[PDB]
């Protein structure tokens, strides 16, 4: 015979405290990012890598109000799925684009020192934009608002074909990690190291990127490992993953505010 | 919206599963988790299986 166990997961009251705490840091990030990226864009308009980086960061920051509004309601989506699909599109397009424009700047700055060139540079920039757009499209396509039959509570998650669910989760996870962290960080790090041949600002660029985006990808990887049941299940583990995911998401969005001061103002 | 299971295993055998665990969560209601003896891995079962619901609803009603 098969022995059947029973498990319950009682509600944890720490959710409200943590979510309301982070809803304030997000507003801090929003205001700082606006007053920083706006100045950078005004300066450039009055080197289009920084313009491209400033535009991408500004568009990512603009979506902060939507996230905090959905957060105060315990990750509840009251708006229509059209806003959900649209919001998840501007965020994911401009979050990828800003990361790519760091890698292009890493090579381009190194390129000039070692060596219609502006035409080639523009072609690369537009190519990066289209590449970011193509990478974002899949997730947004499968996104639709939902209403559970027990909570009577509306959420906005991603529905994937039932016969193939593992495929999409693992595939999209791997795309983000190997095309958002592994490849961009490697190119940026190697080229800046070669350029090292002030010498403190170079190390400053690389360490800031690593600190902002390393713990977040570690948290996502841990979450995905738990989905595949490599890590045994338990309620305390779920709360830790919940807390770690949200905290690291905040520590990532600080990237949109540290970009312009680090790359455009210290100089 | 995050709960222990995201996908089921629609192709499982009675003689393979050696342990079933019922999870009750505020997000995804009841769910089933199975320990396959061959792979010694935790997998999530699909209630569509006839023997699954029969066995489970017999255990709970006891």
């Amino acid at each position, epitope marked *: 015979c098969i022995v059947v166990d029973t498990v319950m997961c009682p509600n944890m009251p720490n959710k409200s405290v943590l979510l309301y705490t982070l809803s304030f840091i997000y507003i801090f990030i929003f205001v700082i990012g606006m007053i920083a990226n706006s100045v950078v864009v005004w300066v450039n308009i009055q080197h289009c890598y920084i313009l491209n980086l400033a535009i991408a960061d500004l568009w990512v920051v603009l979506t902060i109000p939507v996230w905090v509004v959905s957060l105060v309601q315990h990750n509840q989506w009251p708006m229509g799925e059209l806003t959900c699909k649209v919001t998840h599109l501007i965020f994911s397009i401009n979050l990828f684009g800003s990361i790519f424009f760091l890698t292009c700047m890493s090579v381009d700055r190194y390129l000039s020192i070692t060596y219609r060139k502006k035409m080639v540079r523009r072609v690369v920039c537009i190519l990066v934009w289209l590449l970011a757009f193509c990478v974002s499209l899949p997730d947004t396509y499968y996104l639709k608002t939902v209403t*559970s*039959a027990s*909570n009577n509570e509306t959420y906005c998650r991603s529905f994937y074909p039932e016969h193939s669910i593992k495929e999409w989760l693992i595939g999209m996870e791997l795309v983000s990690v190997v095309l958002g962290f592994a490849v961009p960080f490697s190119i940026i790090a190697v080229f800046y190291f070669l350029l090292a041949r002030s010498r403190k600002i170079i190390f400053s660029y690389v360490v800031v990127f690593l600190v902002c985006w390393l713990p977040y990808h570690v948290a996502v990887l841990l979450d995905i490992f738990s989905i595949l049941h490599y890590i045994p299940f338990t309620c305390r583990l779920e709360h830790a993953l919940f807390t770690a995911l949200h905290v690291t998401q905040c520590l990532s969005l600080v990237h949109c505010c540290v970009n312009p001061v680090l790359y455009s103002f210290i100089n | 919206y995050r709960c222990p299971c995201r996908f089921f295993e629609s192709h499982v055998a009675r003689a393979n599963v050696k342990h079933l665990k*019922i999870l*009750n969560t505020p997000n995804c*209601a*009841l769910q089933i988790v199975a320990r396959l003896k061959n792979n010694n891995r935790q997998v999530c079962i699909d*209630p569509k299986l006839k023997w699954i*619901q029969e066995y489970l*609803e017999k255990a709970l009603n006891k």
Partner: antibody, heavy 125, light 107 residues
């Protein structure tokens, strides 16, 4: 072994109130939601409301919202439907039925496995 | 949702196949159940999901789905199969039943 025995059904004046009970005994009341189904005297079945025993999620039909309120007591293993501002049309036989809300990718199990012999609730002046 | 159930009532003799049909007003992902209420007794469950057979009932009953057009079928009607059959969906938070269909003896 399973049983959902009701009580608290009798004559009531219009605009009054009445509290019903459903003493579940023989299964895990913690894991199962409880529904209330009313069948008028000579008409099809109608749905009233359910409750999640432990997490306290409740939904009400469009014809009882604002008047009925379903609660539960796991320690007592009972579910109470307290009805207020009862009308003449509320005359019916009320059944309480168990459900085990299994998770299906698109929906939840909602077939009322077990029912209890209802209790007439006459509402007449 | 308004789970229209037709026909209003059927006249069938023993040993004659019967078919009661249900129709949802909006798409429900195979979430439909069928009950049988003999007179003056609590209803009973026959077929949950959309075609899955609840434990204990005879194999005669069958279920099917075609978009949003569910059906029930008693392959070989027996003397004790004369009752009212109800159609119930549980996709949306608000459950609904069917108007009912009575099976009457033929004479």
């Amino acid at each position: 072994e399973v049983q959902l025995v009701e009580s608290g059904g009798g004559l009531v004046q219009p605009g009054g109130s009445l509290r019903l009970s459903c003493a579940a005994s023989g299964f895990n009341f913690s894991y199962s939601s409880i529904h209330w189904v009313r069948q008028a005297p000579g008409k099809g079945l109608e749905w009233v409301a359910y409750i999640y025993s432990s997490y306290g999620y409740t939904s009400y039909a469009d014809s009882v919202k604002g008047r009925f309120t379903i609660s539960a007591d796991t320690s007592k293993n009972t579910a109470y439907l307290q009805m207020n501002s009862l009308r003449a049309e509320d005359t019916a036989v009320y059944y309480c039925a168990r459900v085990y809300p299994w998770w299906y990718y698109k929906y939840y199990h909602g077939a009322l496995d077990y029912w209890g012999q209802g209790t007439l609730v006459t509402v007449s002046s | 949702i308004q789970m229209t159930q037709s026909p209003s009532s059927l006249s069938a003799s023993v040993g004659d196949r019967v078919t009661i049909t249900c129709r949802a007003s909006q798409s429900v992902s195979s979430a439909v159940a069928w009950y049988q209420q003999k007179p003056g007794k609590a209803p009973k469950l026959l077929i949950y999901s959309a075609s899955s057979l609840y434990s204990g009932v005879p194999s005669r009953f069958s279920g099917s789905r075609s978009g949003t057009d569910f059906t029930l079928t008693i392959s070989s009607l027996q003397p004790e199969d004369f009752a009212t059959y109800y159609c119930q969906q549980y996709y949306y938070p608000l459950f609904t039943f069917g108007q009912g269909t009575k099976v009457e003896i033929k004479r």
